């Protein structure tokens, strides 16, 4: 038996594998084996055959594929090039399956920012230089839809930085109708928005400048419009604009989501710039004028009296089989998010689930069943389990399909469904070794094991792993949920050093039953430390009071919760009081800096990796969702009295390590620059390190360097 090593974590050795089937029908799915071959599996017949060999993939150096619903053409993608967290560009080739040769005559240009098949048939829509092009057939000249697309100014069919990162969390902004006879897209205008500029060095004599339109807290915002166009005769009347509700089009507003109900019925969701109110609208198609109409009687309003609307994002509706009623998750009269059924009016909604727990997600609404996720089982808010409810049946029914499958190995589930919910797949992430299984779909009976991760289990037999526990504390009528990681051969009669890992971000959760082998695991296994994570007020999935306790006051209660948890841990009786440390990343940097400079004398050293300095330096959407406008009339006082720099005097008797990357676009380098300037102006000693031309993720060898440096720092403090 041997302990973990740093090189084991850095060069990923103990990493699991998952299996998400690529459903192409109600009974078939595609996969890529460990031979670069694309194989089609049929469940009913049980046979399989290859639809694309590795020779064809290697012929054009392809790395990804996409199959048309007709199973006549495939597209292969090469020349991958990442731009932001979600967006990238590539080069696409089209392969004909019937004739076994590439399509010749009209090749797609390059690079291409997004590409999608139609749901029915084989016709393509793609985005090239912020413009949308439509192809009726893969061997036809394209038809151009938009003309005003300009780099860094106007975006057609794709989001800008703000919407991609904070609102949509996707790389595309175009949607096909269910039968593919209409196409809906969004146009973003970024012309008055201020620009953030930084320096990129590269390998050349002179460095260059990178400019991004970036609205900070209180600045101007993009302008978004929505269009729908007919894909059979696009030249008849051209694109049509969807009307905005009168109550929304009175000030600045946002765009939340779009979802198709039918070929003549679409749904849109709007948010006000003040995130207190959200509106859901349903629009229909008028054939006598070839246009779209949104009646006022089909508007639904959701508002929150004590905080923002929804969680991190606004919930999306799932429509029934009759396409006139839907199901949605929002908070009930007791402040718990549950499922409601809406037919005509919001005030007539029917509550489907109730209790002192929360519903997380809605997966599928079939003709007679509803699948969802919850943490109801045994009142553990860190687990996820899948429940199935019968709808439209004479006796009501409700069952839990995952809480007794593998009780001691799997308590954190996710699901993926096929067409018409004939079959589905369950993926389990912890607390045991992750697993992936295929289920019947009508009787919830196991069929085959897609992924078992036997090699990892064989590799982990000769390794001593730390012991993890999840418990709770009750302090001052507030319940805190903590996860404790203890070294092997733990003895309660000795004293151990303590390290705290903090994120603390709003609408987040850090205490989950998820399997992972990471840096803190190595720290506990080899260096003999005790690690702890604490979840307190401001987090999600425990009620509206706990979630909204931190409204308009950021950086006040998280520090108190961390300090209270540390004091309780010290009172437990096996913690060395003179060796305690704390660290975090990009919101735990903020909380770590605020807790280290709290003047309580509890922490000895702290680490802040790419922290946020002041809320005036971050994006408008995220900041204004939880803080409000930074004006003298509304919330300027707390904007001023919340920065890290204001505590610069209290860093005198502690050890501080500050790390940031110079080419960061999410949390800009100016935060760390201002922190360092404030610390210097007060004559306080600290340490620092920068990474050149590195983004927010610090990918590559920068990760090895960062973790080695942090290990050295921690080993020096606890010596």
């Amino acid at each position, epitope marked *: 038996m041997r302990a973990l090593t740093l090189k084991d974590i850095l060069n990923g050795t103990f990493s699991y594998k998952t299996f998400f089937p690529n459903w192409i029908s109600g009974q078939e799915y595609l996969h890529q084996s460990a031979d670069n071959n694309i194989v089609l599996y049929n469940i009913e017949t049980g046979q399989s055959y290859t639809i694309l060999s590795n020779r064809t993939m290697k012929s054009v150096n392809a790395s990804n594929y996409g199959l048309s619903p007709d199973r006549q053409f495939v597209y292969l993608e090469s020349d991958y090039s990442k731009l932001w967290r979600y967006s990238y560009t590539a080069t696409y080739y089209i392969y004909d399956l019937s004739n076994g040769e590439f399509v010749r005559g009209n090749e797609l240009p390059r690079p291409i920012q997004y590409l999608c098949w139609s749901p029915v048939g084989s016709k393509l829509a793609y985005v090239y230089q912020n413009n949308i092009y439509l192809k009726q057939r893969p061997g036809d000249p394209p038809f151009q839809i938009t003309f005003n697309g300009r780099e860094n100014k106007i975006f057609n069919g794709i989001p800008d930085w703000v919407y991609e990162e904070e609102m949509l969390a996707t790389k595309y902004a175009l949607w096909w109708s269910p039968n593919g006879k209409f196409l809906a897209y969004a146009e973003f205008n970024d012309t008055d928005i201020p620009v953030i500029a930084y320096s990129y060095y590269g390998d050349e004599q002179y460095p260059r400048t990178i400019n991004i339109p970036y609205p900070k807290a209180g600045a101007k915002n993009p302008v978004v419009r929505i269009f729908i166009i007919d894909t059979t*005769y*696009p*030249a*008849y*009347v051209g694109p049509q604009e969807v009307p905005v509700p009168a109550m929304i089009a009175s000030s600045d507003y946002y765009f939340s989501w779009l979802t198709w109900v039918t070929d003549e019925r679409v749904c849109l969701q709007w948010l006000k710039r003040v995130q207190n109110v959200s509106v859901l609208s349903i629009c229909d198609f008028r*054939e*006598d*004028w*070839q246009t779209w109409d949104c009646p006022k009687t089909q508007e639904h309003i959701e508002e929150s009296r004590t905080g923002w609307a929804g969680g991190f994002f606004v919930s999306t509706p799932v429509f029934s089989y009759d396409a006139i009623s839907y199901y949605k998750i929002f908070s009930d009269k007791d402040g718990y998010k549950h499922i409601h059924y809406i037919k005509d009016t919001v005030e007539n909604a029917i509550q489907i689930t109730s209790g002192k727990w929360e519903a997380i997600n809605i997966f599928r609404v079939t003709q007679d069943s509803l699948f969802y996720s919850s943490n109801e089982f045994e009142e553990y808010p860190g687990r996820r389990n899948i429940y199935r409810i019968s709808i439209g049946s004479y006796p009501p029914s409700k069952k839990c399909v995952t809480c007794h499958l593998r009780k001691e190995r799997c308590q954190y589930y996710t699901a993926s469904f096929s067409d018409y919910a004939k079959y589905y797949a369950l993926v389990c992430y912890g607390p045991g070794i992750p697993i992936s299984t295929l289920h019947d779909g009508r009787t919830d009976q196991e069929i085959k094991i897609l992924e078992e991760n036997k090699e990892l289990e064989n590799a982990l037999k000769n390794i001593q792993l730390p012991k993890e526990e999840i418990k709770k504390l009750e302090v001052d009528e507030i319940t805190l949920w903590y996860k404790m990681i203890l070294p092997p051969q733990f003895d309660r009669s000795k004293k151990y050093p303590l390290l705290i890992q903090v994120y603390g971000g709003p609408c987040s959760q850090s205490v989950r039953s998820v399997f992972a082998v990471n840096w803190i695991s190595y720290l506990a296994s080899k260096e003999g430390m005790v690690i702890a994570l604490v979840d307190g007020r401001g987090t999600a999935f425990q009620g509206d009071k706990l979630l909204y306790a931190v409204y308009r006051k950021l950086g006040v209660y998280e520090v108190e919760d961390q300090i209270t948890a540390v004091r309780k841990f010290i009172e437990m009786g096996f913690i060395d009081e003179k060796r305690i440390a704390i660290w975090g990343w990009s919101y735990g940097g903020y909380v770590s800096s605020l807790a280290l400079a709290s003047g309580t004398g509890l922490f000895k050293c702290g680490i802040a990796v790419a922290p946020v300095s002041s809320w005036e330096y971050y994006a408008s959407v995220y900041t204004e969702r939880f803080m409000g406008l930074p004006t003298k009339d509304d919330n300027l006082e707390h904007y001023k009295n919340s920065t890290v720099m204001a505590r610069a005097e209290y860093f005198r008797n502690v050890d501080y390590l500050l790390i940031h990357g110079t080419a960061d676009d999410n949390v800009h380098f100016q935060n760390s620059a201002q922190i360092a300037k404030a610390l210097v102006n007060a004559q306080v000693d600290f340490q620092a390190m920068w990474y050149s031309d590195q983004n927010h993720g610090l990918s590559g060898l920068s990760t090895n360097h960062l973790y080695t440096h942090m290990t050295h720092f921690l080993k020096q403090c606890f010596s």
Partner: nanobody
Amino acid sequence: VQLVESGGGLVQPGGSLRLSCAASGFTFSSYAMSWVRQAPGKGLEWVSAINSGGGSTSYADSVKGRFTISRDNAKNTLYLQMNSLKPEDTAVYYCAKARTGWSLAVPSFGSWGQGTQVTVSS
């Protein structure tokens, strides 16, 4: 259904023209009428629409302020007059019959005739 279009031809830019549409078979004065054009190498483009009574007219954004459409139910004729032409309207014009006479309604893809060719160049 029978429809015949007359007029058009080759004309220099900046001129003016007018063309007529005559329909038979169905009952006139009970449906809205429309004028559509087809350009070489392009698809069908809707130009203008006229109500079944002749009170209100609708025009596209590309021919706004330059085309005038009228009808006469006594002679069962439809007239469209173009003025201040530009060297991009060279196309063949078709006469379309709607399916709703209760009010104005753009015909989607109903009956099509042979149309008349109009070419403008220097």
